[PDB]
Scaffold this motif. Sequence first.
Motif, PDB file in Angstrom:
ATOM      1  N   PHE A 147       4.700   7.723   3.275  1.00  0.00           N
ATOM      2  CA  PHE A 147       3.736   6.637   3.441  1.00  0.00           C
ATOM      3  C   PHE A 147       2.682   6.653   2.360  1.00  0.00           C
ATOM      4  N   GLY A 148       2.689   7.687   1.524  1.00  0.00           N
ATOM      5  CA  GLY A 148       1.833   7.694   0.328  1.00  0.00           C
ATOM      6  C   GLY A 148       0.402   8.119   0.585  1.00  0.00           C
ATOM      7  N   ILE A 149       0.188   8.852   1.684  1.00  0.00           N
ATOM      8  CA  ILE A 149      -1.167   9.287   2.072  1.00  0.00           C
ATOM      9  C   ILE A 149      -1.191  10.745   2.474  1.00  0.00           C
ATOM     10  N   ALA A 150      -2.356  11.352   2.353  1.00  0.00           N
ATOM     11  CA  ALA A 150      -2.638  12.624   2.971  1.00  0.00           C
ATOM     12  C   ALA A 150      -3.675  12.380   4.087  1.00  0.00           C
ATOM     13  N   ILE A 151      -3.538  13.113   5.190  1.00  0.00           N
ATOM     14  CA  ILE A 151      -4.580  13.145   6.200  1.00  0.00           C
ATOM     15  C   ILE A 151      -5.191  14.534   6.379  1.00  0.00           C
ATOM     16  N   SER A 152      -6.523  14.554   6.547  1.00  0.00           N
ATOM     17  CA  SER A 152      -7.262  15.750   6.991  1.00  0.00           C
ATOM     18  C   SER A 152      -7.899  15.552   8.384  1.00  0.00           C
ATOM     19  N   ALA A 210       0.409   2.739   0.035  1.00  0.00           N
ATOM     20  CA  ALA A 210      -0.857   2.617   0.746  1.00  0.00           C
ATOM     21  C   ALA A 210      -1.972   2.132  -0.174  1.00  0.00           C
ATOM     22  N   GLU A 211      -1.677   2.052  -1.466  1.00  0.00           N
ATOM     23  CA  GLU A 211      -2.674   1.660  -2.462  1.00  0.00           C
ATOM     24  C   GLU A 211      -3.059   0.192  -2.318  1.00  0.00           C
ATOM     25  N   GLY A 212      -4.363  -0.074  -2.357  1.00  0.00           N
ATOM     26  CA  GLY A 212      -4.919  -1.381  -2.014  1.00  0.00           C
ATOM     27  C   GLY A 212      -5.040  -1.637  -0.509  1.00  0.00           C
ATOM     28  N   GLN A 213      -4.508  -0.739   0.307  1.00  0.00           N
ATOM     29  CA  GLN A 213      -4.526  -0.948   1.740  1.00  0.00           C
ATOM     30  C   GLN A 213      -5.405   0.018   2.538  1.00  0.00           C
TER      31      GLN A 213
END
Length: 105
Positions: free
Chosen positions: A19-24, A50-53
Amino acid sequence: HMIWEQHTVTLHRAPGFGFGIAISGGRDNPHFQSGETSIVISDVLKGGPAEGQLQENDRVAMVNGVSMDNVEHAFAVQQLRKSGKNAKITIRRKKGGGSSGKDYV
């Protein structure tokens, strides 16, 4: 003075990004000095889906209808990983408050 803007984004996995993201964050491991236990977007990959979103520091409130309120970090990760080609992610964005001279009307 402070608002939280909320909306849902559908993310589409790209092969080669996920999904192109990291979560902390998470109750086991607050991402914040304050001790806030929220799940947060901590990275959005350039060119990824996820870029621009989404933006770093967006609070993840829900992932495909499952609440991210005060959960284990591992619980949040598994939910996102468990998802098919799409993740519907509800996020909350902090605007104004504290330092800014903004008032929302």
